[PDB]
Amino acid sequence: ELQELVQYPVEHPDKFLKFGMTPSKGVLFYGPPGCGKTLLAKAIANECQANFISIKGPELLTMWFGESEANVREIFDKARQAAPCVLFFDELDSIA
Amino acid sequence: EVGYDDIGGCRKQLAQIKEMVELPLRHPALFKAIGVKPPRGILLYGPPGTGKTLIARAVANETGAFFFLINGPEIMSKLAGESESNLRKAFEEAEKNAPAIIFIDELDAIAPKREKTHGEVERRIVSQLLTLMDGLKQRAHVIVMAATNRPNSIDPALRRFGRFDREVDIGIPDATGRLEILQIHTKNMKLADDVDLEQVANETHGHVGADLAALCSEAALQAIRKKMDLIDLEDETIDAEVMNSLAVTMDDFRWALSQSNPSALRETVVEVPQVTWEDIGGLEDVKRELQELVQYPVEHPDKFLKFGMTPSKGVLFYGPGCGKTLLAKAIANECQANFISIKGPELLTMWFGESEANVREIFDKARQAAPCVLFFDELDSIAKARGGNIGDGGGAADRVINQILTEMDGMSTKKNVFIIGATNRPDIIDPAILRPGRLDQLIYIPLPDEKSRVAILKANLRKSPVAKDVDLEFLAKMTNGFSGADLTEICQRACKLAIRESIESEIRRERERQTNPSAMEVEEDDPVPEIRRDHFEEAMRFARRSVSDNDIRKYEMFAQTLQQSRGFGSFRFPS
Amino acid sequence: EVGYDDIGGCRKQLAQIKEMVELPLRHPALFKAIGVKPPRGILLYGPPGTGKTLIARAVANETGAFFFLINGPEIMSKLAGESESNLRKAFEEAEKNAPAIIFIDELDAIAPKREKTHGEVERRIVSQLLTLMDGLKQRAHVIVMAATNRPNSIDPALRRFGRFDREVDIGIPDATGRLEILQIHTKNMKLADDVDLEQVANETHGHVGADLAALCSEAALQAIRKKMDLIDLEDETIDAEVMNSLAVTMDDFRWALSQSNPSALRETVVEVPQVTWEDIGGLEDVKRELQELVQYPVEHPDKFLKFGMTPSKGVLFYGPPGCGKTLLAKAIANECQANFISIKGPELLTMWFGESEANVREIFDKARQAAPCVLFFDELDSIAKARGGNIGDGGGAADRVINQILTEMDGMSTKKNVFIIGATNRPDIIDPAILRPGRLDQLIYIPLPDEKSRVAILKANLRKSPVAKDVDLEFLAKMTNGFSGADLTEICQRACKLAIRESIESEIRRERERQTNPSAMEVEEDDPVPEIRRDHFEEAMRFARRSVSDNDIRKYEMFAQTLQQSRGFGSFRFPS
Ligand SMILES: Cc1cc(OCc2nnc(SC3CCCC3)n2-c2cccnc2)ccc1-c1ccc(S(C)(=O)=O)cc1
Ligand SMILES: Cc1cc(OCc2nnc(SC3CCCC3)n2-c2cccnc2)ccc1-c1ccc(S(C)(=O)=O)cc1
Ligand SMILES: Nc1ncnc2c1ncn2[C@@H]1O[C@H](COP(=O)(O)OP(=O)(O)O)[C@@H](O)[C@H]1O
Ligand SMILES: Nc1ncnc2c1ncn2[C@@H]1O[C@H](COP(=O)(O)OP(=O)(O)O)[C@@H](O)[C@H]1O
């Protein structure tokens, strides 16, 4: 499934364009701690040979406590510059 | 030279500038015998790279006025005490060649003071410029046009009467204007036949005229790199025929678009939505009511004036993915009025940041782009953020909604902006929003019917190749209570299944030639050229109803919570 | 030249300026034999484009005083160290031509320092200007008038005694003044007969004199574009007769109004409300009580002084929504012909959310300047609702905005003219301190309109709309057992909407017939629905609804009897 969602649009963009389907650009891994979600994201990034950016929970908590969310804009701009990239938001539920 | 043809984008403010400047310039002698004050200054503002200087130069050339360009930093870079001489000499020279147009590019550098006004010499420059601008003795016909990123960046005294009394927001070009900009920027490169500039234009959302030119140049450079370099036959001047032999292919443009990085994607878009009533399959009562409320006052303003009735300028859509945003876009498209959409994330950002003055800026932008349909999508987001069952200790009032109410109360003057609100939680919406003069006309958008579902499926599958074998009416009828979002998900899943099957099949077939090289090459074409019945059956296997019947029950409750009494249904006059 | 005729708006501060300046200027020799200090400086402030410079020039011309104009940036644009020479020479030249008027346009540039006072040379300019202004040796009769957007923008020392001791807020022109401004700005364009300038004036809310001139010019340019361009017959000078043949039509003015963008719609409006007691059909006890409280102290101040009674300067309207409290306040203001200032709930909520209650001080000062005025605080309970109402915050009813309002009211009453009127739909949650003596103590209850009141409300709502005599209005009013004013307005609006839709649909179909079957002889039968009929009103009433439930009326009745005059004194008799 990860191979599909990430690799297929780039390896075969023509076939995605033929059917007029825009591939999803977001995937949310859910599961118990320590099962390899971060490793899975790294592996999927490696297979596509695309840059990998990891935003762990401490960074999000720092942005939330400091009331400085403009860093999200900077992070997204950095991810945009390093394309192809896999922007991974590890442990996104930390703020909740 | 440069003219209206060079000015691309068809953004329809060039026409306004023309109407502004012909008679003052095209017929200057007329104003000599008629007592009227022409436009002494015009403030063109918008994102950088939108061609404001190009527009001014084209107007000057097409009207014959002597164009004078006063670069912001050109004068600012000069030594203090003699830059003032440069500005004064520029105005005198422009005065000599009456009629003349004085263009001040990057005006936010000569007079950037927003009442902060740091420094000493820059205050002198701003004050002297003010004296010159207000010093126009209405003699001759010098028109001073200035360029600025935003109206509030320049000194407010420059915005006052007689200095710059009228402003035009050039704004980002739209798909139609992006296409015309591409055409103007692609006219001497001998564009290939396969490339059409239409697909690129649609995918070019977020670019400006400068961005479009840069993308075209990058595509040309990719074409030059791909070919004519392998041969490496180069001289002092490349042969014209050799260079003409190359044609910019669609692949080069696609790569350039991938390498675009548009310079202001975030900037708000003021564009006539391309959505049409065809996309929505039904809502005939809702469609007619929307047509009434919006279109009737403008199509037949005289009849509204005859009965002394002021049409409501606010409508609040409530409902469960049912197409409220699409309905608003369709209604805007029918009236051919600009559409501005304020999604929930923007409101939440204004609320978290405690910056509600952005509401004032948003309303001003909507006012400038008239006729417009200011849509506040998912307006209940702030109430949800504060709770909804218990929430905060205070009432429903919040900073952002209060500012919106203040702007609406101070609105209606413009006679063109129309506020449309969409909310999935009508119970938690602030009651003040529904008071008269606000979004009082509540419209309920129900789950799409069978016919509506068929139309939604057709709209979602219009682009995708769908085999005639797969019956769409049966699928729509089968989906008893699927929402528009659910139908879209089903169509997307079917397309995904078809794409995966096609990719896997052609990949295997390629192994088959590599493993067993056939003596004669005869491709059988695509094993799956269009979406079939089995793909749709597998996709529907995963079909799901996002909207439960309990939330539909709550919406039905609110709807009957706007109950027209139960005793007047038989009201008859005494006769 | 320019005179009182050119000065439009009839805003009634030009009269005050005249009364200020005639004797100092019109009779300068009189002050030589009488020991009195005239007005050394007058500070005209208001929104830009209101004609302050025009007013000063007109006063100078009509009084014969030598007018001198000291442009703000003209001196500011000059080189440092020699601008001071320009200011000093300007005062000396004005001194020579006594009597003279020195006008300082855009005074907020020469002396903008609000005690922040950035820079060095500008401090010199402000101090030297202060020395000159205070240096007037009371000889000659030079009067220094200055223009500024707001009083607080200029240096406070300029506002002190002897520099600028009296201020006039020209303010935005009103409908009557907007109409007069349009007349003055439309006098040489040969305005068409169809255009009346009255409808445009009413729809011109939010414009200033400059805005009105710009709108008129835009309409003229639209007329010039629509015609005389198609012919394209142009020469060095357009023929006067050819240009006169065109008449500015109502359509051109309508388009210009659509393309106006008034330069200060948000600015607060100080205007005599046009609403009259006719709009409200009843409230005779309430009407008489309001007449007493407001009108009696001014119409007969002597009798109030005789009994040594100070009339209450605060009234709090309480009642269900949509019953006409705002309209009642406007009517009472209109009867006394006093300016009306309305502070709706959104403004209070903005001040509360932004933690900026100093705006209350500014609002009260503005009300004080525009005397006689009726300062109305519409929906004053908004802050209490925002904080809760059933449980609310942990603290009491006191809040920042209400506390500032109380402080201003306590510091008020000095003016003897501002009258505070408060309207609230939730009297239970209103702060009790608001009702203490010296505050809005006179509580007035506005009940749901009666049958006669309902008839009057329906007539007022339907006065503009063409209503057929067949539709009986008394029957409709009586039929509506408990409809509020808002409910009646909604019914009338729905009936008008139904009539408009039917007329549009019918004439549209009738046009298809002409197009589908071109008739040999054109004979329009006029409008198929020329006025609102019985069927339209029946369909509209089909959707009639009672916004105000009987339970909230029960709560209001409870509070009303919660202001119960005891139960043992009703028979009080003196011993005789
Ligand atoms: C005649 C009139 C037109 C109007 O405006 C019409 C209008 N133009 N562009 C637009 S906007 C654009 C259209 C599509 C997207 C938005 N509108 C408009 C107005 C209201 C609601 N929707 C549109 C207002 C009010 C009136 C009048 C009604 C009664 C009376 S009397 C004293 O009782 O006789 C006087 C004046
Ligand atoms: C004589 C007097 C007049 C007054 O003011 C009258 C007034 N003029 N403009 C206005 S305002 C405008 C009118 C319509 C809108 C608002 N008012 C006014 C005053 C109070 C309430 N409403 C209006 C105050 C107080 C007194 C006095 C009473 C007793 C005594 S003793 C020592 O016991 O003998 C001394 C002084
Ligand atoms: N609609 C357009 N048609 C042709 N060129 C455009 C257009 N829009 C932008 N450009 C390009 O933008 C370049 C510079 O942008 P400019 O006109 O100076 O606007 P700004 O001053 O706001 O940056 C120009 O050299 C021009 O090539
Ligand atoms: N009531 C009025 N009657 C005639 N002209 C007015 C009026 N109000 C404003 N104007 C116009 O406003 C123009 C400039 O405004 P101005 O008098 O300088 O006020 P301010 O200095 O505050 O901007 C004038 O040229 C005049 O035509």
UniProtKB/Swiss-Prot annotation, chain B:
Major subcellular location class: cytoplasm
Impact upon substituting residue 115 to A: Does not affect methylation by VCPKMT
Record-listed ATP 1 binding positions: 48-54, 149, 185
Record PTM: Phosphorylated by tyrosine kinases in response to T-cell antigen receptor activation. Phosphorylated in mitotic cells. ISGylated.
Complexes and interactors: Homohexamer. Forms a ring-shaped particle of 12.5 nm diameter, that displays 6-fold radial symmetry. Part of a ternary complex containing STX5A, NSFL1C and VCP. NSFL1C forms a homotrimer that binds to one end of a VCP homohexamer. The complex binds to membranes enriched in phosphatidylethanolamine-containing lipids and promotes Golgi membrane fusion. Binds to a heterodimer of NPLOC4 and UFD1, binding to this heterodimer inhibits Golgi-membrane fusion. Interaction with VCIP135 leads to dissociation of the complex via ATP hydrolysis by VCP.
Record note on domains: The PIM (PUB-interaction motif) motif mediates interaction with the PUB domain of RNF31.
Protein name: Transitional endoplasmic reticulum ATPase
Full-sequence range covered: 200 to 775 of 806
From Swiss-Prot, chain C:
CC annotations in GO: ATPase complex; azurophil granule lumen; ciliary basal body; cytoplasm; cytoplasmic stress granule; cytosol; Derlin-1 retrotranslocation complex; endoplasmic reticulum
Chain positions with N6-succinyllysine modification: 469
Recorded consequence of changing residue 188 to H: In IBMPFD1; uncertain significance
Phosphothreonine carried by residues: 237
Binding site for ATP 1: 48-54, 149, 185
Location(s) in or outside the cell: Cytoplasm, Cytosol; Endoplasmic reticulum; Nucleus; Cytoplasm, Stress granule
Disease listed for this protein: Inclusion body myopathy with early-onset Paget disease with or without frontotemporal dementia 1: An autosomal dominant disease characterized by disabling muscle weakness clinically resembling to limb girdle muscular dystrophy, osteolytic bone lesions consistent with Paget disease, and premature frontotemporal dementia. Clinical features show incomplete penetrance. Frontotemporal dementia and/or amyotrophic lateral sclerosis 6: A neurodegenerative disorder characterized by frontotemporal dementia and/or amyotrophic lateral sclerosis in affected individuals. There is high intrafamilial variation. Frontotemporal dementia (FTD) is characterized by frontal and temporal lobe atrophy associated with neuronal loss, gliosis, and dementia. Patients exhibit progressive changes in social, behavioral, and/or language function.
Protein name: Transitional endoplasmic reticulum ATPase
Species of origin: Homo sapiens (Human)
Protein encoded by which gene: VCP
From-to range in the entire protein, with total length: 200 to 775 of 806
